[PDB]
Design a protein around this ligand. Structure first.
Ligand SMILES: N[C@@H](CC(=O)O)C(=O)O
Ligand SMILES: N[C@@H](CC(=O)O)C(=O)O
Lengths: 294, 618, 289
């Protein structure tokens, strides 16, 4: 959830809770991938305790605005559309699972390292690794597209919601943070190396969805670029990407070297004074690099 | 101005040969027998038996010295003529003239007073000592740069540019509420920052009658206006110019009423403005952001909302119409355009841009000049006592929806098409206009210019097509509603009339020629799509107007445009091939032997000739 | 060194030193890499870094294939060193972020005065600013705030790390790296102090580079590092905020304003490795700790 992001975003996430859902008693998962940022450094620990305490107290002496009737009604319809799109890809595409097992390291996570039957942590993990993040954004695209086509004034209503309704703003902000951790070019590389050619068209379709959804999210947030309202986070993510990108490329080729007995490489003579150990290192490093998403 | 009065005052002297005057007038003329050197025709020594000539002769001397002092101060920065020998404010000038007026009326000569003297008094009151008041205009960000350098020099961990809008207002209001100087030569200044401050310095040193409004381009926020108010005071402008935000983008217009309400709620600003505020809108500017139909409807509504804000705070609001609107057409169409303003947006105070491409038609010929003054005066008076009908609820709803469709179509072409700027740079003389970012950074005037030259006019009509198509598809009775709006609603009728006039100046065949000669063939499909849009948009405009042909309701304008076209077409063909001869080093022509007794010169001539031929569009 | 500066050309705050932190850490780590594995290894790591930083600049897919041609030519032993190296560089980058976040000075004039202020640490209300808005904007009384505060609980539930459980002694090495980074850029730092902080930073970078019960002990690591002392430090701040709105009482010391819970060794959902004995063990471990 948005309350699980840690940092500053957690503060508004708590305040955005529906009225009277806190009432002096907040119980919140501190996700393992966030605990170091939340409590590792003494000032940040202090500020974590502070924002949970302050937002809890303020909520319910100061509940957020209740949604306008037309906001409720639009989200009720968008939820139908978004679930249909999400489910049409994840459960009703007969080859989705096959593609999932090729395009991501999910099988190799699930034999070490810690779809209806799959647990949620591996589901999020697999698509985080390849910088694609399908579980987080899939469905927003159809929902936004439906809404703007249904009544042309919904474009402006969605933007009012983002500006005026804390629940909707923090929901979009998290999607935007996750898109900023995405790179469909790296995902495309996993496809090129790991996915049979008869599924490349499917993969490219998902990436067009990624791009259209990203732009619909940006339009709803009134932003020309990702994290336009948060240059501090944008800077931090940019300074991480180089190291994560290196580990991504390394992971993708290492997976092909592990899986494909007919993939020929020309080693250079040993430089330094199993390939599985490398795979494990890239998984831990990529996860450490990307921390929380959905 | 002084020269115009000086070349007129002797005619008043010659004519006012009367000897009858009041005791007050005689007193005044008897003195001046010792407190004709310089003259145009009136050379003789003025006898005391001609009292009006004595008074007016002294005015002539002051006008000569006023003229020559200004000529010297302008030419060589220095003048030997003391200010006390000149008219430095209009009150000094008016006093002896009004003395002449009341004396004549008191002596039974009010018919004479109401002749040339009355004309002269009205000229002084109209034109003052400057003929015109000068507006100063500068971008908001340039003022933010100044305040950022100032606050950064304070070394307090952050500076003005970092602060939120609320943070900026907080700092500005504490400065404005306080006595502490903002300045000192202790300030590192860029070129641009010195330009801003030196502009204010120049303002501070000149008579306040010289200036009108300080206009802030790209204004969005109360801090933009307060920033200028602070800088005026701290640069020692003793009579600060009224400050006028120009809200340009659609989102800026939507936020303009709340920004103006916040300013009016601020005690210091409320006191400063003394019950008056001007706000500038720019039709071409807003149409470049969002397309002309959506800019036009949002400007109608923004003015509705600004009037509400002004009424709530007891402020007299003047809307300043920038270029590109129906009020900028000149001729007859301007008359209905003013009457079509939203109710109470005029209220006895009309401020309108006279576009340079229109000034000759508006004022060049004496009858047309008279009729221009007349229609502006008549329409301004009528509008306050006879507002146009307010739109029916279903008209507003339809326009609210069409504006979204139209902006979507406009922006999908202009900002989203990856190759649009590329095409724009080829199909159009835009780059050559400059020689002698993308569209967002491009100014509105070159944007309109570029497509005017090729007779395509894309900035004016793009987006009307999708909007009308959407409306007709959504409900079959909207076509009849669009036609009822054209028949019944002045705003909608003048809006469509302008589009029809611009289509009458357009020729997609000529635009296609520019493509053929100048655009990569991989982009020919794109241009062809735009021209199909041109044609569909034109026919839906004609349907809305209930017209089978362009300008069906105006045979006078249709005749005029038809008689220009053959010359313009020649210049178009010449410009297109001249552009190819300039750009394409591999383009071969067979010259014929020289006929008569650089190609860049020809290009310039075609651009000026085509612009003169097409005058105003959007 | 820079090129980072080309990745991120602008400062986000006047006290923004993040690029400098990263350049410093990267420079010292590469020297350590060279000392331990040779100049060729270091130059290869440095080449990969340049390629991926070039990728971040424009995101050409061909730069990813250049990356691949190098990476795919590495034998297993060199692959481990390289992937270890870039993982450690990421860890160093995150330590620098923490230092930067910890010491970014608050600019009050950045606040907009609306709820969007609460989405960023640079603008969010601290506890006293929350008190003061509740009083002045919501008309709450200080007694009402105090009474609600006394009866409130925040319960933070720790869960296991899905990929990497980090041991307490590594956390201490990370804190010394952070401490060196923070002190190195202090105002009037002496040349010999700076020289010694640099040498301390180098040795801690190198030291760092070189079962459900285990997961739980790892995850219980944040109590001794920060939370144990952090809790009464923050509760003392609440007292200070209370006095500043007119409440002279401290928060009663037995009020459970802050509680911690845990799933480590209790969540058996789809995890047969969490046995009844595991649960008994973590209960005894927690009481021992
Ligand atoms: N925790 C940050 C992102 C990150 O540090 O990876 C956020 O949720 O905004
Ligand atoms: N100014 C005229 C057109 C023209 O003379 O070019 C109009 O607006 O109708």
């Amino acid at each position: 959830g948005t309350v699980g992001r840690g940092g500053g975003p957690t503060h508004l996430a708590i305040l955005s809770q529906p009225p009277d859902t806190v009432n002096g008693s907040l119980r919140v998962t501190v996700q393992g991938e966030v605990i170091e940022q939340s409590f590792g450094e003494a000032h940040l620990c202090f500020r974590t305790l502070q924002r949970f305490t302050a937002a809890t107290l303020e909520h319910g002496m100061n509940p957020p605005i209740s949604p306008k009737p037309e906001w409720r009604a639009l989200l009720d319809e968008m939820a139908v559309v978004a679930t249909e799109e999400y489910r049409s890809v994840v459960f009703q595409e007969p080859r989705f699972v096959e593609y999932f097992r090729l395009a991501t390291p999910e099988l190799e996570y699930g034999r070490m390292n810690i779809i209806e039957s799959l647990r949620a942590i591996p589901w999020i993990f697999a698509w985080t690794q390849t910088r694609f993040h399908l579980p987080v954004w899939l469905g927003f695209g159809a929902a936004f597209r439906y809404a703007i086509k249904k009544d042309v004034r919904n474009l402006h209503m969605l933007q009012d919601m983002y500006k005026q309704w804390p629940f909707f703003r923090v929901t979009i902000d998290l999607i935007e943070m996750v898109f900023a951790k995405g790179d469909p070019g790296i995902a495309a590389l996993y496809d090129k190396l790991l996915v049979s050619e008869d599924l490349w068209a499917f993969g490219e379709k998902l990436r067009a969805n990624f791009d259209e959804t990203k732009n619909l999210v940006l339009q709803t947030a009134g932003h020309k670029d990702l994290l336009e309202g948060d240059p501090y986070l944008k800077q931090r993510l940019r300074l991480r990407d180089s190291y994560i990108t290196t580990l991504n490329v390394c992971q993708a080729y290492t997976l092909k070297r592990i899986r494909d007995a007919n993939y020929n490489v020309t080693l250079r003579p040993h430089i330094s004074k199993g390939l599985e150990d490398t795979l494990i290192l890239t998984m831990k490093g990529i996860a450490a690099g990307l921390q929380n998403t959905g | 101005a002084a020269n115009l009065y000086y070349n007129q005052i002797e005619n008043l002297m010659f004519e006012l040969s009367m000897w009858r005057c009041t005791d007050e007038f005689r007193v005044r003329a008897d003195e001046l027998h010792r407190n004709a050197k310089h003259y145009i025709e009136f050379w003789k020594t003025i006898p005391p038996t001609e009292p009006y000539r004595v008074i007016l002769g002294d005015v002539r001397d002051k006008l000569y010295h006023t003229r020559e002092r200004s000529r010297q101060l302008l030419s060589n920065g220095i003048s030997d003529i003391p200010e006390e020998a000149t008219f430095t404010n209009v009150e000094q000038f008016l006093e002896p003239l009004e003395l002449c007026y009341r004396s004549l009326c008191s002596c039974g000569d009010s018919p004479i007073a109401d002749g040339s003297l009355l004309d002269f008094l009205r000229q002084v009151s109209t034109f003052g000592l400057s003929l015109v008041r000068l507006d100063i205009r500068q971008e908001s960000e340039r003022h933010t740069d100044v305040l950022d350098a100032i606050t950064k020099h304070l070394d307090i961990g952050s500076s003005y540019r970092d602060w939120s809008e609320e943070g900026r207002q907080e700092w500005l209001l504490a400065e404005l509420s306080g006595k502490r100087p903002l300045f000192g030569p202790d300030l590192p200044k860029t070129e641009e920052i010195s330009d801003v401050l030196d502009t204010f310095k120049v303002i501070s040193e000149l008579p306040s009658d010289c200036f009108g409004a300080y206009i802030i381009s790209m204004a969005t926020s109360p801090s933009d206006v307060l920033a200028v108010e602070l800088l005026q005071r701290e640069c020692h402008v003793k009579n600060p110019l009224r400050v006028v935000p120009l809200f340009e983008k659609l989102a800026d217009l939507e936020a303009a009423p709340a920004a103006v309400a916040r300013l009016f709620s601020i005690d210091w600003y409320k006191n400063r403005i003394n019950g008056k505020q001007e706000v500038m809108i720019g039709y071409s500017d807003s149409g470049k952001d969002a397309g002309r139909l959506s800019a036009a409807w949002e400007l109608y509504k923004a003015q509705e909302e600004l009037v509400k804000v002004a009424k709530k705070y007891g402020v007299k609001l003047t809307m300043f119409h920038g270029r590109g609107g129906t009020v900028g057409r000149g001729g007859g169409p301007t008359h209905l355009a003013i009457l079509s303003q939203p109710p109470d947006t005029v209220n006895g105070s009309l401020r309108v841009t006279v576009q340079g491409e229109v000034i000759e038609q508006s004022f060049g010929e004496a009858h047309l000049c008279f009729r221009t003054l007349q229609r502006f005066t008549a329409a301004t008076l009528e509008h306050g006592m006879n507002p146009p009908i307010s739109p029916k609820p279903e008209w507003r709803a339809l326009l609210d929806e069409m504006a979204v469709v139209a902006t979507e179509e406009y922006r999908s072409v202009v900002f989203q098409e990856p190759r649009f700027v590329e095409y724009f740079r080829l199909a159009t003389p835009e780059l050559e206009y400059g020689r002698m970012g993308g569209i967002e950074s491009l100014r509105a005037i070159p944007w309109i210019f570029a497509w005017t030259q090729t007779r395509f006019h894309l900035p004016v009509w793009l987006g009307f097509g999708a909007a009308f198509r959407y409306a007709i598809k959504k409900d079959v009775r909207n076509l009849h509603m669009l036609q009822d709006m054209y028949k019944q609603w002045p705003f909608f009728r003048v809006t469509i009339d302008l589009i029809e006039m611009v289509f009458a100046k357009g020729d997609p065949g000529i635009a296609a020629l520019y493509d053929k000669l100048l655009v990569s063939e991989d982009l020919w499909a794109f241009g062809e799509k735009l021209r199909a849009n041109f044609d569909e948009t034109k026919n839906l405009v004609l349907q809305t107007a209930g017209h089978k042909d362009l300008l069906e309701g105006d045979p006078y304008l249709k005749q005029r445009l038809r008689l220009r076209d053959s010359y313009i077409t020649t210049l178009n063909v010449c410009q297109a091939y001249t552009l190819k001869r300039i750009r394409d080093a591999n383009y071969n022509v067979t010259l014929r032997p020289h006929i008569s007794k650089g190609l860049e010169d020809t290009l310039i001539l075609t651009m000026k000739g085509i612009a003169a031929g097409l005058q105003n569009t959007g | 060194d820079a090129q980072l500066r080309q990745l991120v050309p602008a400062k986000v705050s006047e006290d923004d030193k993040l690029v400098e932190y990263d350049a410093l850490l990267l420079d010292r780590f590469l020297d350590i890499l060279q000392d331990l594995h040779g100049e060729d290894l270091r130059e290869t790591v440095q080449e990969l870094y340049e390629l991926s930083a070039e990728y971040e600049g424009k995101r050409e897919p061909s730069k990813l294939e250049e990356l691949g041609s190098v990476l795919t030519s590495l034998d297993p032993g060199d692959s481990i060193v390289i992937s270890k190296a870039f993982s450690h560089m990421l860890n160093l980058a995150n330590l620098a972020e923490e230092v930067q976040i910890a010491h970014r000075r608050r600019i009050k004039k950045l606040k907009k005065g609306d709820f969007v202020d609460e989405s960023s640490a640079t603008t969010e209300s601290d506890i006293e600013e929350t008190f003061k808005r509740l009083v002045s904007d919501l008309g709450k009384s200080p007694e009402e705030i105090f009474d609600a505060l006394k009866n409130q609980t925040v319960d933070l539930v720790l869960t296991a790390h899905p990929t990497q459980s980090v041991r307490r002694s590594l956390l201490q090495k990370h804190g010394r790296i952070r401490d060196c980074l923070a002190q190195l850029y202090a105002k009037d730092i002496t040349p010999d102090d700076k020289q010694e902080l640099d040498e301390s930073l180098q040795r801690e970078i190198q030291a760092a580079f070189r079962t459900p019960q285990d997961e739980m002990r790892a995850g219980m690591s944040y109590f001794h590092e920060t939370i144990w002392k952090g809790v009464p430090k923050f509760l003392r701040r609440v007292d200070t905020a209370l006095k500043n709105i007119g409440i002279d009482e401290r928060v009663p010391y037995n009020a459970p304003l802050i509680q911690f819970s845990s799933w480590m060794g209790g969540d058996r959902d789809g995890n047969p490795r969490v046995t009844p004995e595991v649960t008994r063990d973590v209960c005894l471990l927690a009481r021992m700790m």
